[PDB]
Scaffold this active site. Structure first.
Site, PDB file in Angstrom:
ATOM      1  N   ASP A   1     -33.056  11.881  14.715  1.00 30.78           N
ATOM      2  CA  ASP A   1     -32.854  10.703  13.886  1.00 30.78           C
ATOM      3  C   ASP A   1     -33.867   9.626  14.251  1.00 30.78           C
ATOM      4  O   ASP A   1     -34.214   9.452  15.422  1.00 30.78           O
ATOM      5  CB  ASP A   1     -31.432  10.163  14.053  1.00 30.78           C
ATOM      6  CG  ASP A   1     -30.990   9.312  12.879  1.00 30.78           C
ATOM      7  OD1 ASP A   1     -30.780   9.872  11.783  1.00 30.78           O
ATOM      8  OD2 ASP A   1     -30.853   8.083  13.052  1.00 30.78           O
TER       9      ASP A   1
ATOM     10  N   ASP B   1     -26.979   9.187  16.993  1.00 31.19           N
ATOM     11  CA  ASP B   1     -26.125   8.204  17.643  1.00 31.19           C
ATOM     12  C   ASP B   1     -25.265   7.400  16.681  1.00 31.19           C
ATOM     13  O   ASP B   1     -24.167   6.987  17.059  1.00 31.19           O
ATOM     14  CB  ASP B   1     -26.968   7.231  18.482  1.00 31.19           C
ATOM     15  CG  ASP B   1     -27.944   6.429  17.644  1.00 31.19           C
ATOM     16  OD1 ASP B   1     -28.196   6.808  16.481  1.00 31.19           O
ATOM     17  OD2 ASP B   1     -28.452   5.406  18.149  1.00 31.19           O
TER      18      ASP B   1
ATOM     19  N   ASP C   1     -24.568   9.925  10.368  1.00 29.29           N
ATOM     20  CA  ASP C   1     -24.816  11.346  10.561  1.00 29.29           C
ATOM     21  C   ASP C   1     -23.690  12.041  11.319  1.00 29.29           C
ATOM     22  O   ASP C   1     -23.927  13.084  11.941  1.00 29.29           O
ATOM     23  CB  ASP C   1     -26.146  11.555  11.289  1.00 29.29           C
ATOM     24  CG  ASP C   1     -26.264  10.710  12.541  1.00 29.29           C
ATOM     25  OD1 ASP C   1     -25.372   9.869  12.779  1.00 29.29           O
ATOM     26  OD2 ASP C   1     -27.250  10.886  13.288  1.00 29.29           O
TER      27      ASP C   1
HETATM   28  F1  ALF Z   1     -31.843   6.472  10.038  1.00 21.62           F
HETATM   29 AL1  ALF Z   1     -30.323   7.235  10.578  1.00 21.62          AL
HETATM   30  F2  ALF Z   1     -28.803   7.999  11.118  1.00 21.62           F
HETATM   31  F3  ALF Z   1     -29.955   5.800  11.574  1.00 21.62           F
HETATM   32  F4  ALF Z   1     -30.690   8.670   9.583  1.00 21.62           F
HETATM   33 MG   LIG Z   2     -29.477   6.388  13.606  1.00 20.16          MG
END
Ligand code: ALF
Ligand SMILES: [Mg+2]
Length: 991
Positions: A416, A700, A704
């Site tokens: 991520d 984190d 997700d």
């Molecule tokens: F940019 Al993210 F979970 F924080 F995909």
């Molecule tokens: Mg993230």
């Protein structure tokens, strides 16, 4: 999915309860697919308008679900979705928005507030707003987890051991299994409790009522169709609402992962269907933190509730990660048929030699339960516990030890952008335009370069909460600001930022000698157009479009001397994500070890490609894939920046809607996925796992969570509510926690394979030993069996799982198949070798001068002492250590063998005590009930045979470790299998 439902409430009140209470005995085997057991007792065949027991029929899928219909209007619960019954349509329909049948924008304007009427029926249909988490009691967890064939066989083995004189080890196994069961139940209960505590919510909300009154009730009373008032100060969003008037700034970090304001407008137009997907700019999702709300008409903001509960993906994520969350079954089956042939051969032997008079039902089941050892789960779990302890010592917390063995076959790791690879806050390095005369574009300049008014504006224009202001004040070098070193400047007032004005102004009235100035901050286009009469712009739009294509945030500053009408541009402030320096070596080693790494982010595609190019994910080239539109008669153009592809949210949706074609190619070659929804991420993870891919999600944030839970393994950083089910959890926020986890998983997989091989060899050699003992018609003592099964099994299980992972990541992954060609060939060779060497000693001592031969008339446990039983025990105890030393490994992907000092000294002590018990008698074979032979030549020959078998096993292991006939003779090759490799070769051939 196309599926049907049918049933009938009751047959007749009567003997059916007795039938159920007498047929509930085979429920243990009727647990799986209980539709037959349900239809065998209670299944009327009549009209089906009213039903209570609902069964699931197999039309396109292969499943069986049992549901209960409750009466409130009748409905039933299925995967967390309510299904009410309609009398007019005479069919079951899902409880959700009416967009499937017919929808428009006039009802959204006509639903301004609802009275007390029609509220109870809507609450009963749609259900409560709170998401009810189904909790289960201790017997429920017991019947759900236990009562599988393995535990049934273990209980049968325990009962058989209790029937014999095997009480001590039987109760030991029973107590350790009970401790394991209670530990697993406590872990599952704690997980369910923390999940229920995280999902549940309760806060006071404002609901509008017809007539001009507003009441404050609980959030559970909120039903889709009323009006919700957003608070001015902000707060947690408990339900989905649609803006009807005014605009508000909301943070969508719960769905995207970025703490940035989202532009949300009202609905000024009407006469249009409500899709709730293309109108994301008007309505906002649930669970979003409210920052600032406003409205140009009315004393409060007007927002209508459209869907609550399991409708706006809130309960959808939970229902998608809970229920459909995705060599086992051949080794135990091969050992079962092998035991069946062995248990029937002993019956023919016992029926002829002594006719034990009904003591065959005990001796045969003994061999049956010896063939399949019950100490395999403990020997496989001790390694996982040791790996978890090592990870906790390193700083990685693990909650599920069974995933450690599966963590050794990882081939696709997801990273991520926000939080995992980079930080959550926004940093700053300086101002690119050093002068306010529209300087030419160049590389960004560091801080501390400006001085005077520009430095004062960059160090004082702040609303100090905001991480950008903190970064600015810590990078400007000023900490009233001391160490200027001119006279410090003081501020008197500041203008708070709002939604009406996109520019934040700050006035200064310091009593300094020179004239004070006022500095503002906001959108660059506004200040550029306002400062036109003061200064002229030169190459101003190119910089903005370049920063927008490169994923940079633009911030402009203006100044005006006072003794917002006039302004003067001074410089432009840029932002970065502050790519960590430790991220590049990790991805470099991953690409070197042939470990594919993809990027799943929720921002735009430009920032994704920029981060991928800055980190080094796409070395040869980068390709972008975008679709013209969503409506039919579309196209698939090719846009230019192995082969890597980049997709988007709607792009991936259009690709997955075309599943029967070119989807595996996109799944294999595509590596960049931007603007991915949580449900979209879960669907992508499921589609990737459907292609036999060991996808590992690492994130984190809370967006997700679905992809982190639906994946095989989940690495959780920055401990929060999204780390309650994920097994892997690291305390630090560093990215280097992935290679150590991969190494630990590979080491655990290798150790588990070695333990399985050793257990199979031990079981087979014990089987052949029992065979030759029944041929001799004698049985070993229970004390010797207990002593062996303790001081060998527990010893190896404690002292063989201490080996640590390799120093660096390996080039080739360990084989994760317990039924491969070389593993089976080496096992069969070791088995035939041990079978040839074991019975050889008996045939040799049969020709040697023997004294006082045994009589095959007394019972098996009564013929002791004798020579045959003690020599068989000695040979078996020797071959046990032979196999333990042969199956010992750790050279390729683990710690060296000579480094294991405890295991080495334990093997040395075991060999010493064995040669002491064999060579010299007395003080060591008292309770063992042995003959205590004093033949020195026989002992010397036995030691020579042990040494020759030792060197032969070593030579066999050395020649089998080369696997030359398994690779050089691979005609035909491994093609027509491993669909991933087939797709890769097809892509490299067609392109
Ligand atoms: F940019 Al993210 F979970 F924080 F995909
Ligand atoms: Mg993230």
């Amino acid at each position: 999915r196309l599926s049907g439902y049918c049933g009938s409430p009751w047959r007749v009140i009567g003997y059916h309860v007795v039938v159920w209470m007498m047929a509930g005995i085979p429920l243990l085997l009727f647990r799986w697919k209980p539709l037959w057991g349900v239809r065998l007792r209670l299944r009327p065949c009549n009209l089906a308008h009213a039903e209570t027991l609902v069964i699931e029929i197999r039309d396109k899928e292969d499943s069986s679900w049992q549901l209960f219909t409750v009466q409130v209007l009748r409905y039933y619960l299925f995967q967390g979705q309510r299904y009410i019954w309609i009398e007019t349509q005479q069919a079951f329909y899902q409880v959700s928005l009416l967009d499937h049948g017919r929808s428009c924008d006039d009802v959204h304007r006509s639903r301004h507030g609802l009275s007390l009427q029609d509220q109870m029926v809507r609450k009963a249909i749609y259900g409560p707003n709170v998401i009810s988490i189904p909790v289960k009691s201790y017997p429920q967890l017991l019947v759900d987890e236990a009562l599988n064939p393995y535990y049934g066989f273990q209980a049968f083995s325990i009962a058989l051991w209790l029937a014999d004189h095997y009480y001590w080890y039987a109760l030991c196994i029973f107590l350790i299994s009970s401790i394991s069961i209670c530990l697993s139940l406590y872990k599952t209960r704690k997980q369910s409790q923390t999940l229920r505590d995280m999902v549940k919510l309760s806060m006071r909300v404002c609901v509008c009522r017809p007539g001009g009154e507003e009441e404050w009730v609980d959030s559970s009373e909120l039903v889709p169709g009323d009006c919700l008032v957003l608070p001015q100060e902000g707060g947690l969003m408990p339900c989905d609402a649609a803006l009807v008037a005014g605009e508000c700034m909301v943070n969508e970090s719960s769905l995207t992962g970025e703490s940035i304001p989202v532009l949300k407008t009202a609905l000024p137009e009407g006469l249009g269907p409500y899709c709730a997907e293309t109108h994301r700019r008007h309505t906002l999702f649930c669970g979003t933190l409210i920052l600032q709300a406003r409205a140009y008409v009315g004393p409060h903001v007007l927002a209508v509730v459209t869907r609550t509960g399991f409708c706006t993906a809130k309960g959808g994520l939970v229902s998608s990660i809970l229920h459909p969350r995705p060599h086992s079954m051949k080794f135990v089956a091969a050992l079962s048929v092998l035991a069946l042939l062995g248990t029937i051969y002993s019956i023919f032997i016992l029926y002829r030699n002594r006719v034990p008079l009904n003591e065959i039902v005990i001796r045969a089941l003994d061999l049956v339960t010896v063939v399949v050892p019950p100490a395999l789960p403990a020997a496989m779990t001790v390694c996982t516990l040791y790996a978890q302890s090592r990870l906790r010592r390193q700083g990685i917390f693990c909650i599920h030890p069974l995933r450690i063995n599966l963590g050794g076959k990882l081939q696709l790791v997801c990273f991520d952008k926000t939080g995992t690879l980079t930080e959550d806050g926004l940093d700053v390095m300086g101002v690119v335009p050093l002068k306010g005369q529209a300087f030419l574009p160049l590389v960004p300049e560091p801080r501390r370069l400006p001085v005077g008014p520009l430095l004062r504006a960059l160090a004082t224009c702040h609303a100090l909460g905001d991480p950008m202001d903190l970064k600015m004040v810590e990078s400007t070098g000023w900490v009233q600001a001391m160490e200027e070193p001119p006279v410090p400047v003081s501020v008197l007032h500041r203008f708070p930022f709002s939604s009406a004005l996109q520019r934040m102004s700050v006035v200064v009235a310091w009593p300094g000698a020179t004239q004070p100035e006022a500095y503002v901050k906001g959108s660059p286009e506004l200040v550029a157009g306002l400062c036109n009469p003061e200064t002229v712009p030169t190459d101003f739009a190119q910089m903005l479009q370049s920063y927008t294509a490169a994923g940079y945030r633009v911030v402009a500053l203006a100044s005006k001397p006072l003794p917002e009408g006039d302004l003067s541009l001074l410089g432009l402030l840029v932002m970065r994500n502050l790519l960590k320096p430790q991220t590049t070596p990790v991805i470099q080693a991953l690409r070197r070890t042939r470990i594919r790494a993809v990027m799943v982010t929720g921002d735009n595609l430009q920032t994704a490609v920029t981060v991928a190019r800055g980190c080094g994910m796409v070395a040869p080239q980068e390709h972008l894939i975008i679709v013209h539109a969503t409506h039919p008669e579309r196209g698939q153009p090719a846009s230019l920046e192995s082969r890597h592809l980049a997709l988007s949210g709607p792009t991936f949706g259009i690709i997955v809607k075309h599943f029967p074609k070119l989807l595996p190619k996109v799944l294999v070659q595509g590596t960049v996925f931007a603007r991915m929804a949580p449900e979209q991420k879960t669907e992508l993870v499921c589609e990737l796992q459907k292609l036999q891919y060991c996808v590992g999600m690492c994130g984190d944030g809370a967006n997700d969570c679905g992809a982190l839970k639906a994946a095989d393994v989940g690495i959780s950083l920055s401990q929060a509510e999204a780390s309650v089910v994920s097994p892997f959890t690291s305390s630090m926020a560093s990215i280097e926690c992935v290679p150590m986890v991969i190494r630990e998983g590979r080491c655990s997989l290798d150790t588990s394979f070695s333990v399985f091989k050793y257990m199979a060899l031990y079981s087979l050699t014990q089987f052949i030993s029992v065979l030759i003992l029944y041929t001799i018609n004698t049985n070993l003592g229970d004390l010797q069996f207990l002593a062996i099964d303790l001081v060998i099994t527990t010893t190896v299980a404690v002292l063989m799982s201490r080996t640590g992972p390799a120093l660096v990541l390996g080039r080739v992954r360990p084989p994760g198949a317990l039924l491969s060609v070389p593993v089976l060939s080496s096992l069969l060779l070791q088995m035939v070798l041990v079978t040839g060497v074991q019975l050889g000693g008996y045939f040799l001592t049969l020709a040697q001068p023997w004294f006082v031969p045994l009589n095959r008339t007394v019972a098996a446990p009564d013929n002791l002492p004798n020579y045959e039983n003690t020599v068989v025990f000695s040979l078996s105890s020797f071959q046990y250590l032979i196999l333990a030393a042969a199956v010992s490994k750790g050279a390729p992907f683990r710690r060296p063998l000579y480094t294991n000092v405890p295991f080495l000294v334990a093997l040395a002590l075991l060999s010493s005590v064995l040669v002491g018990l064999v060579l010299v008698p007395g003080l060591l074979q008292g309770p063992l009930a042995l003959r205590n032979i004093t033949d020195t030549g026989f002992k010397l020959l036995l030691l020579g045979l042990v040494t020759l078998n030792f060197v032969g096993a070593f030579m066999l292991e050395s020649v089998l470790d080369q696997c030359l006939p398994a690779c050089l003779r691979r005609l035909r090759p491994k093609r027509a299998s491993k669909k991933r490799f087939k797709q890769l070769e097809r892509e490299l051939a067609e392109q």
